[PDB]
Design an enzyme around this catalytic site. Structure first.
Site, PDB file in Angstrom:
ATOM      1  N   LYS B  44     -50.094 -26.833 -17.527  1.00 50.34           N
ATOM      2  CA  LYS B  44     -50.923 -26.284 -18.590  1.00 50.34           C
ATOM      3  C   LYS B  44     -50.110 -25.382 -19.518  1.00 50.34           C
ATOM      4  O   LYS B  44     -49.346 -24.542 -19.053  1.00 50.34           O
ATOM      5  CB  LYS B  44     -52.051 -25.463 -17.943  1.00 50.34           C
ATOM      6  CG  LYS B  44     -52.908 -24.659 -18.921  1.00 50.34           C
ATOM      7  CD  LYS B  44     -53.703 -25.555 -19.896  1.00 50.34           C
ATOM      8  CE  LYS B  44     -54.284 -24.755 -21.068  1.00 50.34           C
ATOM      9  NZ  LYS B  44     -55.013 -25.677 -22.044  1.00 50.34           N
ATOM     10  N   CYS B 131     -51.172 -26.124 -30.797  1.00 53.89           N
ATOM     11  CA  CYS B 131     -52.515 -25.763 -30.326  1.00 53.89           C
ATOM     12  C   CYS B 131     -53.459 -25.524 -31.520  1.00 53.89           C
ATOM     13  O   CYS B 131     -53.160 -24.696 -32.387  1.00 53.89           O
ATOM     14  CB  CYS B 131     -52.455 -24.522 -29.455  1.00 53.89           C
ATOM     15  SG  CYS B 131     -54.096 -23.953 -28.965  1.00 53.89           S
TER      16      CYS B 131
HETATM   17  C1  LIG Z   1     -59.059 -30.433 -21.894  1.00 58.66           C
HETATM   18  C2  LIG Z   1     -57.902 -30.447 -22.866  1.00 58.66           C
HETATM   19  C3  LIG Z   1     -56.908 -29.471 -22.694  1.00 58.66           C
HETATM   20  C4  LIG Z   1     -55.676 -29.602 -23.333  1.00 58.66           C
HETATM   21  N1  LIG Z   1     -54.707 -28.625 -23.175  1.00 58.66           N
HETATM   22  C5  LIG Z   1     -53.479 -28.771 -23.789  1.00 58.66           C
HETATM   23  C6  LIG Z   1     -52.477 -27.833 -23.609  1.00 58.66           C
HETATM   24  O1  LIG Z   1     -52.616 -26.907 -22.786  1.00 58.66           O
HETATM   25  N2  LIG Z   1     -51.251 -28.021 -24.236  1.00 58.66           N
HETATM   26  C7  LIG Z   1     -51.027 -29.121 -25.038  1.00 58.66           C
HETATM   27  O2  LIG Z   1     -49.934 -29.283 -25.583  1.00 58.66           O
HETATM   28  N3  LIG Z   1     -52.025 -30.039 -25.227  1.00 58.66           N
HETATM   29  C8  LIG Z   1     -53.238 -29.882 -24.603  1.00 58.66           C
HETATM   30  N4  LIG Z   1     -54.213 -30.829 -24.793  1.00 58.66           N
HETATM   31  C9  LIG Z   1     -53.921 -31.919 -25.761  1.00 58.66           C
HETATM   32  C10 LIG Z   1     -53.492 -33.110 -24.910  1.00 58.66           C
HETATM   33  O3  LIG Z   1     -52.269 -32.810 -24.255  1.00 58.66           O
HETATM   34  C11 LIG Z   1     -53.302 -34.364 -25.764  1.00 58.66           C
HETATM   35  O4  LIG Z   1     -52.254 -34.113 -26.678  1.00 58.66           O
HETATM   36  C12 LIG Z   1     -54.568 -34.804 -26.511  1.00 58.66           C
HETATM   37  O5  LIG Z   1     -55.725 -34.639 -25.697  1.00 58.66           O
HETATM   38  C13 LIG Z   1     -54.450 -36.255 -27.039  1.00 58.66           C
HETATM   39  O6  LIG Z   1     -54.279 -37.162 -25.962  1.00 58.66           O
HETATM   40  P1  LIG Z   1     -55.501 -38.079 -25.418  1.00 58.66           P
HETATM   41  O7  LIG Z   1     -55.937 -38.908 -26.590  1.00 58.66           O
HETATM   42  O8  LIG Z   1     -54.947 -38.881 -24.261  1.00 58.66           O
HETATM   43  O9  LIG Z   1     -56.568 -37.114 -24.969  1.00 58.66           O
HETATM   44  C14 LIG Z   1     -55.433 -30.716 -24.143  1.00 58.66           C
HETATM   45  C15 LIG Z   1     -56.418 -31.689 -24.311  1.00 58.66           C
HETATM   46  C16 LIG Z   1     -57.652 -31.570 -23.682  1.00 58.66           C
HETATM   47  C17 LIG Z   1     -58.497 -32.817 -23.665  1.00 58.66           C
HETATM   48  O1  LIG Z   2     -56.129 -24.886 -24.623  1.00 57.17           O
HETATM   49  C1  LIG Z   2     -56.500 -25.577 -25.585  1.00 57.17           C
HETATM   50  O2  LIG Z   2     -57.541 -25.332 -26.237  1.00 57.17           O
HETATM   51  C2  LIG Z   2     -55.689 -26.678 -26.168  1.00 57.17           C
HETATM   52  C3  LIG Z   2     -54.329 -26.477 -26.436  1.00 57.17           C
HETATM   53  C4  LIG Z   2     -53.655 -27.527 -27.072  1.00 57.17           C
HETATM   54  O3  LIG Z   2     -52.428 -27.433 -27.319  1.00 57.17           O
HETATM   55  N1  LIG Z   2     -54.323 -28.654 -27.394  1.00 57.17           N
HETATM   56  C5  LIG Z   2     -55.638 -28.792 -27.154  1.00 57.17           C
HETATM   57  O4  LIG Z   2     -56.225 -29.846 -27.499  1.00 57.17           O
HETATM   58  N2  LIG Z   2     -56.325 -27.807 -26.547  1.00 57.17           N
END
Ligand SMILES: Cc1cc2nc3c(=O)[nH]c(=O)nc-3n(C[C@H](O)[C@H](O)[C@H](O)COP(=O)(O)O)c2cc1C
Ligand SMILES: O=C(O)c1cc(=O)[nH]c(=O)[nH]1
Ligand SMILES: Cc1cc2nc3c(=O)[nH]c(=O)nc-3n(C[C@H](O)[C@H](O)[C@H](O)COP(=O)(O)O)c2cc1C
Ligand SMILES: O=C(O)c1cc(=O)[nH]c(=O)[nH]1
Lengths: 312, 312
Positions: B44, B131
């Site tokens: 995370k 983010c």
């Molecule tokens: C619940 C949630 C939490 C996420 N937390 C982070 C995060 O801590 N750091 C980050 O770089 N991306 C975070 N993301 C973004 C994801 O890493 C990813 O880039 C984004 O969801 C697109 O991929 P997907 O289409 O497979 O969901 C988060 C996404 C979601 C759904």
């Molecule tokens: O913690 C989050 O809200 C979060 C961080 C991030 O980099 N990307 C995202 O979709 N959510």
């Protein structure tokens, strides 16, 4: 119960219209949109000279939406101006003319000639600041100083109410800045959110190939892909531009999708990809469906719920 | 036929890993990801101090994807650093540690302490510059001057190979500029495209309400909605950063989706929304489905088709 409304000193039978670029390039297209049950129509974004546009294939549709790199193929401003001045039957519905010059000078040239026709006929200008598909020409409204310059020069040259077709933004600071720029211009009476989500890429797994030819397969996205983005932008500008109208565009396939746009703040609701795929029959279905949802919920007017999306 | 990769001086059984933020916040989560059939895992995104994050509900999923405004809830850098130092089983798979300080100073503070552990254990840094969910903190990488500052200060303080989690861009000019900034930094060895599509808005038609609580319902989009955007960004940086690796993230639900990312140029393939929805069993399914496609096409390794998307 009916969907009739008044906006911008015009009457509209319902809030639905085509999105610019869809079913609106030729006289035939425009006559078809006029004969449809849409509340209004908008012409293809035009340039001073006719354009053939980008190489084919340049549009493709899929279950979740479309990708396009048309490249502003159009019959030239002279044609769309003539349509507005001589051919359009204003007794049927209002007309918007969209312009997308490749420079501020080109836009200024066009609006100076549009002005007398706007004065005489009441055609409405939509200034396109968000074309993502002409090689080497970045979206104007992603450069806020460029956006200010275009709006300054067009306001001065045109001197009449107009609206702007905006690209989607994805950053709260960008919503803040873009809305602040728009609010500097009292002649900007409406804001259309959004143009296609720029420079997406669709790849076909079987052929291992991109699906459109221009720009190595990169093109603007429309349809189901973009609905939450479109709703965000509609609401962001609705909240930040309280003295302007917001027109919603993006991801509308049903009366329910139109309902969401209106809840987000949309006055008119434009239909692009779904109209390209289904044809102008869609307008009777969208009106029927929106009326049905309004009836179920006990709404009698669009004003009762426009912009009334609830937060938690 | 095999899915093996050797990159960044590590060995990976297959290209699949979680996307940062999904199934990786607690020791329990990280142990679960380690026990799965993924080729790697990422923690995370963390901040110097622990964070509760934004008010709930802050994540919602739907047929076409997800919206989130988590607000960087995390157990704090001390915890993730300890996990990397003492707890992770490197004999199982490589570990990436994501950091998302709210200032350049915060990031520098963290990387100074991470460096000795990176040298000792081989943990790999992913710097999150994208983010979209902390109120009042726009995406760093949408401000190219800020991006350069962060990368300069982090390169200087860390002095070891690292990667960057990038936001999606929608403008060719922005691909050009962003990639050029990245190319100034030889320590940036990988680029992860993309983070969520920022500040979308999902509205429920029945309740007439936004579906998440923070920021009036505005949150980052993942899932089906974003695949063509993600592929575009992967390919754009693959083309522009020939001396770096690109990791793909966005819209992966199937081996076919992974295949498309790899065709676009992806080395590792990260899974966010689909993993959040399906759970860690998704990794065995993705492996089987990717190998199925490879078999049908006569591909024996990933290098045979990585970056080999055809244009017209
Ligand atoms: C619940 C949630 C939490 C996420 N937390 C982070 C995060 O801590 N750091 C980050 O770089 N991306 C975070 N993301 C973004 C994801 O890493 C990813 O880039 C984004 O969801 C697109 O991929 P997907 O289409 O497979 O969901 C988060 C996404 C979601 C759904
Ligand atoms: O913690 C989050 O809200 C979060 C961080 C991030 O980099 N990307 C995202 O979709 N959510
Ligand atoms: C074939 C095609 C051509 C388009 N041409 C224009 C154009 O000339 N001017 C413009 O402002 N938008 C143009 N658009 C963008 C649409 O007006 C609309 O903003 C976008 O497609 C999103 O709406 P949708 O989800 O209903 O498709 C075009 C879109 C497509 C599908
Ligand atoms: O002609 C086009 O390519 C076109 C223009 C525009 O403004 N938007 C779009 O999606 N396509």
């Amino acid at each position: 119960m009916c969907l009739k409304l008044n906006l911008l000193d015009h009457v509209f039978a319902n809030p639905f219209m085509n999105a610019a670029g869809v079913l609106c390039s030729t006289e035939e297209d425009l006559r078809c949109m006029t004969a449809s049950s849409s509340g209004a129509l908008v012409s293809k974004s035009c340039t001073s000279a006719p354009r053939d546009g980008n190489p084919e294939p340049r549009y493709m549709a899929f279950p979740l939406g479309s990708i396009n790199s048309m490249g502003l193929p159009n019959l030239g401003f002279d044609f769309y101006l003539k349509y507005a001045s001589d051919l359009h039957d204003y007794s049927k519905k209002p007309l918007f003319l969209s312009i997308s010059g490749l420079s501020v000078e080109e836009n200024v040239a066009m609006v100076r000639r549009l002005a007398p026709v706007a004065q005489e006929k009441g055609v409405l200008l939509e200034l396109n600041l968000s074309c993502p598909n002409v090689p080497g020409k970045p979206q104007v409204a992603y450069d806020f100083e460029a956006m200010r310059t275009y709006l300054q020069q067009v306001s001065l040259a045109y001197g009449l109410p107009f609206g702007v077709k905006m690209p989607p933004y994805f950053d709260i600071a960008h919503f803040d800045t873009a809305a602040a720029v728009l609010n500097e211009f009292p002649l900007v009476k409406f804001v259309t959110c959004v143009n296609s989500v720029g420079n997406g890429l669709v790849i076909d797994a079987e052929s291992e190939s991109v699906v459109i030819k221009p720009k190595q397969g990169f093109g603007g996205l429309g349809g189901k892909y973009i609905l939450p983005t479109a709703l965000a932008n509609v609401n962001a500008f609705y909240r930040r531009c309280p003295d302007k109208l917001v027109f919603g565009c993006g991801g509308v396939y049903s009366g329910e999708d139109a309902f969401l746009h209106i809840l987000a703040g949309a006055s008119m609701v434009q239909v692009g990809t779904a109209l390209q795929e289904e044809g102008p029959g869609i307008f009777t279905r969208l009106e029927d469906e929106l009326l049905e949802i309004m009836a179920r919920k006990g709404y009698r007017t669009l004003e009762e719920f426009r912009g009334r999306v609830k937060t938690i």
